[PDB]
Design a protein around this ligand. Structure first.
Ligand SMILES: [Zn+2]
Ligand SMILES: [Zn+2]
Lengths: 60, 9
């Protein structure tokens, strides 16, 4: 694995990893954090019916 | 929802 990081990175709010190739992402509209679709178990197909995504942390 | 799909290599 590569050492260091890209300063213009976006870290997933669940796994804390950087964005990679051909990955589906979704952003919470309340805290503006980004998440892997795989990490929050949300497919692109499901996200199409989501008007305003609210991450698990903001859903408490 | 605010989503995004990243490109391939
Ligand atoms: Zn949130
Ligand atoms: Zn993740």
């Amino acid at each position: 694995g590569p050492l260091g990081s890209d300063h213009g990175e976006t870290l997933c709010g669940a796994c804390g990893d950087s964005d990679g190739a051909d990955e589906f992402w979704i952003c919470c509209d309340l805290c503006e954090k980004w998440f892997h679709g795989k990490c929050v178990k949300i497919t692109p197909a499901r996200a199409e019916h989501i008007k305003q995504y609210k991450c698990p942390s903001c859903s408490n | 929802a605010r989503t995004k799909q990243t490109a391939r290599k």
